[PDB]
Amino acid sequence: EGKITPVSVKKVDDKVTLYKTTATADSDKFKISQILTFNFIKDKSYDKDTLVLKATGNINSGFVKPNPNDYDFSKLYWGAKYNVSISSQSNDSVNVVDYAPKNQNEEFQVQNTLGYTFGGDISISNGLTAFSETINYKQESYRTTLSRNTNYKNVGWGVEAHKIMNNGWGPYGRDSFHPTYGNELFLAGRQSSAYAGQNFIAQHQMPLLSRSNFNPEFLSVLSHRQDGAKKSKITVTYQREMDLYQIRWNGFYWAGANYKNFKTRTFKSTYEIDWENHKVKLLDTKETENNK
C-alpha cells in the first residue's frame, strides 16, 4: 500500500537519457517497507534497454522480548535472516543481467557502486560513466549471500545471522550447539540463579539486525532485448525469518535451543514495468505468514 512518483527525466548526452520513478509499497502489519527506485537507461548506442532497480526501505526484525516472569523455561523471537528477492515474471525479452552485491559478503558495512558506461557496460566495484548508483547497508554479525534460485530472470539476497558474540564467548550462529548447553547464542549464564525470563543477554548486546530491523540496499539490472512486448512483470519480496530462541533450567544448568525460521513474515509487491513510457504500475501486494 503506497504511491508512485511521476517520472523525472535527465538527458545525459544526446545518446543517453535517464528516467526515474520511485514506488513505495508497505505492510503496516509486518512493519516492512519497500522503496523501489526504477532508473531507466535509454542509450541509442546500445541494442538493449537497461533498468537499474534500487530496492531500499525497511524490514523489521520481529523481535519479541521474553516474559520476565518465566522461571525455568523462557523464549524470545529474533530476526535471524532477511531475504529480498526480485523476479522478472513475464516477457521473454527481459532478463536479470547484473546486480549488487554480486558475491557473498560478511563485512559489517556492505558498500558497492554500480556504474553504466555509454555503450551498455555494467561495472560493479567495492566501496562508494552515464549512470551510477551505490548500495550501503549495515549488517554487523550477519552475512549476505546470493539466493540459490538466482538465474537469468531472478536475483535474491539473504542477510543471515553469522558470527554472534555473547561477551567473549562465540562466535555463535543459528546452528551452534554445545553438547551440554545447547545453542548459547543469547544465554546470559550457564549457572545463573535467575528467572529464565531474566537469563538472556541484554538487547543492546544483541546485533542490531536481530532485535531492531534491517534497512536493505540492493541493486538489480534488468535488460530488455528491444524486440517483443514493451511492458513486463516484476515482483519484489522482502522477508524475515524469525528464530525461536529458548532457554531452560534442568535443575543443574541452563541450556539454549534455537528453532530456525519458526515464524516467517513475507511482503511481495507485483509491478508492471512500462519500458516505453518509463513508468511502473502496482498490480498487486500480498502479505503471507508462516507459523510452525
mmCIF file of N, CA and C in Angstrom, residues 224-279:
data_model
loop_
_atom_site.group_PDB
_atom_site.id
_atom_site.type_symbol
_atom_site.label_atom_id
_atom_site.label_comp_id
_atom_site.label_asym_id
_atom_site.label_seq_id
_atom_site.Cartn_x
_atom_site.Cartn_y
_atom_site.Cartn_z
ATOM 1 N N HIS A 224 16.237 -5.406 -21.438
ATOM 2 C CA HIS A 224 15.156 -5.660 -22.385
ATOM 3 C C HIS A 224 15.797 -5.710 -23.782
ATOM 4 N N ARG A 225 15.560 -6.814 -24.500
ATOM 5 C CA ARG A 225 16.116 -7.077 -25.838
ATOM 6 C C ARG A 225 15.714 -6.196 -27.026
ATOM 7 N N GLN A 226 14.786 -5.264 -26.805
ATOM 8 C CA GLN A 226 14.294 -4.333 -27.836
ATOM 9 C C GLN A 226 13.533 -4.982 -28.981
ATOM 10 N N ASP A 227 12.971 -6.132 -28.656
ATOM 11 C CA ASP A 227 12.157 -6.925 -29.552
ATOM 12 C C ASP A 227 11.116 -7.430 -28.551
ATOM 13 N N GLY A 228 9.889 -7.635 -29.018
ATOM 14 C CA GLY A 228 8.784 -8.104 -28.170
ATOM 15 C C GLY A 228 8.184 -7.030 -27.230
ATOM 16 N N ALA A 229 7.131 -7.402 -26.490
ATOM 17 C CA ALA A 229 6.384 -6.505 -25.580
ATOM 18 C C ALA A 229 7.136 -5.371 -24.878
ATOM 19 N N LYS A 230 6.490 -4.208 -24.777
ATOM 20 C CA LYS A 230 7.084 -3.031 -24.124
ATOM 21 C C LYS A 230 6.913 -3.028 -22.602
ATOM 22 N N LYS A 231 6.060 -3.906 -22.089
ATOM 23 C CA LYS A 231 5.819 -3.990 -20.655
ATOM 24 C C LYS A 231 6.232 -5.364 -20.162
ATOM 25 N N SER A 232 6.611 -5.454 -18.897
ATOM 26 C CA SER A 232 6.986 -6.740 -18.314
ATOM 27 C C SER A 232 6.596 -6.718 -16.838
ATOM 28 N N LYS A 233 6.413 -7.896 -16.260
ATOM 29 C CA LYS A 233 6.018 -8.023 -14.862
ATOM 30 C C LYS A 233 7.238 -8.273 -13.969
ATOM 31 N N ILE A 234 7.211 -7.697 -12.770
ATOM 32 C CA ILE A 234 8.289 -7.872 -11.817
ATOM 33 C C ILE A 234 7.681 -8.004 -10.409
ATOM 34 N N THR A 235 8.280 -8.854 -9.580
ATOM 35 C CA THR A 235 7.819 -8.998 -8.201
ATOM 36 C C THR A 235 9.025 -8.759 -7.310
ATOM 37 N N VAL A 236 8.806 -8.011 -6.236
ATOM 38 C CA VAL A 236 9.847 -7.718 -5.254
ATOM 39 C C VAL A 236 9.306 -8.220 -3.900
ATOM 40 N N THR A 237 10.104 -9.071 -3.249
ATOM 41 C CA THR A 237 9.754 -9.700 -1.973
ATOM 42 C C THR A 237 10.739 -9.365 -0.845
ATOM 43 N N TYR A 238 10.230 -8.835 0.265
ATOM 44 C CA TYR A 238 11.050 -8.549 1.441
ATOM 45 C C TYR A 238 10.507 -9.538 2.454
ATOM 46 N N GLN A 239 11.404 -10.217 3.161
ATOM 47 C CA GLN A 239 11.011 -11.246 4.117
ATOM 48 C C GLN A 239 11.957 -11.353 5.303
ATOM 49 N N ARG A 240 11.422 -11.832 6.426
ATOM 50 C CA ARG A 240 12.230 -12.082 7.617
ATOM 51 C C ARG A 240 11.952 -13.486 8.112
ATOM 52 N N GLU A 241 13.021 -14.157 8.515
ATOM 53 C CA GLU A 241 12.935 -15.474 9.094
ATOM 54 C C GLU A 241 13.187 -15.167 10.558
ATOM 55 N N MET A 242 12.240 -15.542 11.405
ATOM 56 C CA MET A 242 12.365 -15.292 12.833
ATOM 57 C C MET A 242 12.653 -16.611 13.541
ATOM 58 N N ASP A 243 13.687 -16.631 14.376
ATOM 59 C CA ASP A 243 14.045 -17.837 15.119
ATOM 60 C C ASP A 243 13.492 -17.778 16.534
ATOM 61 N N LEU A 244 13.098 -18.937 17.037
ATOM 62 C CA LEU A 244 12.593 -19.031 18.398
ATOM 63 C C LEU A 244 13.784 -19.491 19.247
ATOM 64 N N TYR A 245 14.289 -18.595 20.090
ATOM 65 C CA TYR A 245 15.416 -18.915 20.953
ATOM 66 C C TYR A 245 14.899 -19.146 22.355
ATOM 67 N N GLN A 246 15.174 -20.325 22.906
ATOM 68 C CA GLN A 246 14.698 -20.628 24.245
ATOM 69 C C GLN A 246 15.732 -21.239 25.171
ATOM 70 N N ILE A 247 15.585 -20.930 26.451
ATOM 71 C CA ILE A 247 16.476 -21.444 27.461
ATOM 72 C C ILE A 247 15.660 -22.179 28.525
ATOM 73 N N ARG A 248 16.306 -23.133 29.172
ATOM 74 C CA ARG A 248 15.637 -23.936 30.169
ATOM 75 C C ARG A 248 16.602 -24.410 31.238
ATOM 76 N N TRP A 249 16.134 -24.390 32.484
ATOM 77 C CA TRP A 249 16.902 -24.849 33.646
ATOM 78 C C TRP A 249 16.468 -26.285 33.882
ATOM 79 N N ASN A 250 17.419 -27.205 33.981
ATOM 80 C CA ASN A 250 17.057 -28.609 34.207
ATOM 81 C C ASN A 250 17.339 -29.068 35.655
ATOM 82 N N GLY A 251 17.620 -28.104 36.526
ATOM 83 C CA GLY A 251 17.936 -28.409 37.903
ATOM 84 C C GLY A 251 19.437 -28.332 38.129
ATOM 85 N N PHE A 252 20.222 -28.345 37.051
ATOM 86 C CA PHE A 252 21.691 -28.302 37.149
ATOM 87 C C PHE A 252 22.351 -27.150 36.421
ATOM 88 N N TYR A 253 21.898 -26.913 35.198
ATOM 89 C CA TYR A 253 22.458 -25.880 34.347
ATOM 90 C C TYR A 253 21.397 -25.353 33.403
ATOM 91 N N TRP A 254 21.767 -24.304 32.670
ATOM 92 C CA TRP A 254 20.909 -23.688 31.662
ATOM 93 C C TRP A 254 21.375 -24.212 30.304
ATOM 94 N N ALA A 255 20.424 -24.426 29.398
ATOM 95 C CA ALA A 255 20.726 -24.885 28.048
ATOM 96 C C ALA A 255 19.823 -24.116 27.075
ATOM 97 N N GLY A 256 20.368 -23.739 25.922
ATOM 98 C CA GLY A 256 19.589 -22.993 24.950
ATOM 99 C C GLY A 256 19.229 -23.827 23.746
ATOM 100 N N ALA A 257 18.194 -23.420 23.020
ATOM 101 C CA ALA A 257 17.775 -24.132 21.814
ATOM 102 C C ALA A 257 17.238 -23.103 20.841
ATOM 103 N N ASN A 258 17.718 -23.143 19.610
ATOM 104 C CA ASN A 258 17.246 -22.203 18.616
ATOM 105 C C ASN A 258 16.474 -22.875 17.473
ATOM 106 N N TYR A 259 15.190 -22.570 17.378
ATOM 107 C CA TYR A 259 14.329 -23.110 16.318
ATOM 108 C C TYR A 259 14.442 -22.187 15.090
ATOM 109 N N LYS A 260 15.136 -22.673 14.070
ATOM 110 C CA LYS A 260 15.381 -21.929 12.848
ATOM 111 C C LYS A 260 14.102 -21.663 12.022
ATOM 112 N N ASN A 261 13.882 -20.399 11.640
ATOM 113 C CA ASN A 261 12.718 -19.965 10.832
ATOM 114 C C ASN A 261 11.405 -20.558 11.405
ATOM 115 N N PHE A 262 11.141 -20.275 12.682
ATOM 116 C CA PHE A 262 9.942 -20.785 13.350
ATOM 117 C C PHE A 262 8.716 -19.946 13.010
ATOM 118 N N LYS A 263 8.961 -18.716 12.555
ATOM 119 C CA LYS A 263 7.916 -17.793 12.091
ATOM 120 C C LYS A 263 8.480 -17.045 10.879
ATOM 121 N N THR A 264 7.665 -16.858 9.844
ATOM 122 C CA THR A 264 8.081 -16.145 8.639
ATOM 123 C C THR A 264 7.042 -15.070 8.298
ATOM 124 N N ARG A 265 7.514 -13.886 7.933
ATOM 125 C CA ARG A 265 6.623 -12.797 7.538
ATOM 126 C C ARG A 265 7.134 -12.310 6.185
ATOM 127 N N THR A 266 6.273 -12.379 5.177
ATOM 128 C CA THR A 266 6.652 -12.014 3.819
ATOM 129 C C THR A 266 5.758 -10.956 3.190
ATOM 130 N N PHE A 267 6.375 -10.032 2.467
ATOM 131 C CA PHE A 267 5.636 -8.983 1.776
ATOM 132 C C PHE A 267 6.145 -8.934 0.324
ATOM 133 N N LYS A 268 5.240 -9.200 -0.608
ATOM 134 C CA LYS A 268 5.527 -9.229 -2.035
ATOM 135 C C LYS A 268 4.734 -8.152 -2.771
ATOM 136 N N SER A 269 5.387 -7.439 -3.675
ATOM 137 C CA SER A 269 4.690 -6.441 -4.474
ATOM 138 C C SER A 269 4.883 -6.891 -5.926
ATOM 139 N N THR A 270 3.898 -6.638 -6.785
ATOM 140 C CA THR A 270 3.998 -7.006 -8.193
ATOM 141 C C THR A 270 3.770 -5.733 -8.996
ATOM 142 N N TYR A 271 4.704 -5.422 -9.876
ATOM 143 C CA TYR A 271 4.603 -4.231 -10.690
ATOM 144 C C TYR A 271 4.633 -4.531 -12.182
ATOM 145 N N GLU A 272 3.981 -3.685 -12.968
ATOM 146 C CA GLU A 272 4.044 -3.850 -14.401
ATOM 147 C C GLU A 272 4.985 -2.746 -14.833
ATOM 148 N N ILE A 273 6.093 -3.127 -15.448
ATOM 149 C CA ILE A 273 7.081 -2.159 -15.914
ATOM 150 C C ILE A 273 6.777 -1.744 -17.357
ATOM 151 N N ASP A 274 6.627 -0.443 -17.597
ATOM 152 C CA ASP A 274 6.372 0.065 -18.951
ATOM 153 C C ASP A 274 7.705 0.650 -19.441
ATOM 154 N N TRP A 275 8.459 -0.151 -20.188
ATOM 155 C CA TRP A 275 9.766 0.252 -20.703
ATOM 156 C C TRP A 275 9.717 1.389 -21.724
ATOM 157 N N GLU A 276 8.609 1.496 -22.465
ATOM 158 C CA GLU A 276 8.418 2.565 -23.460
ATOM 159 C C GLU A 276 8.167 3.922 -22.786
ATOM 160 N N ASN A 277 7.306 3.921 -21.771
ATOM 161 C CA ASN A 277 6.970 5.140 -21.058
ATOM 162 C C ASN A 277 7.671 5.363 -19.729
ATOM 163 N N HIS A 278 8.633 4.491 -19.420
ATOM 164 C CA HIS A 278 9.455 4.544 -18.195
ATOM 165 C C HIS A 278 8.627 4.764 -16.949
ATOM 166 N N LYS A 279 7.543 4.002 -16.854
ATOM 167 C CA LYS A 279 6.620 4.074 -15.733
ATOM 168 C C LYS A 279 6.455 2.674 -15.170
#
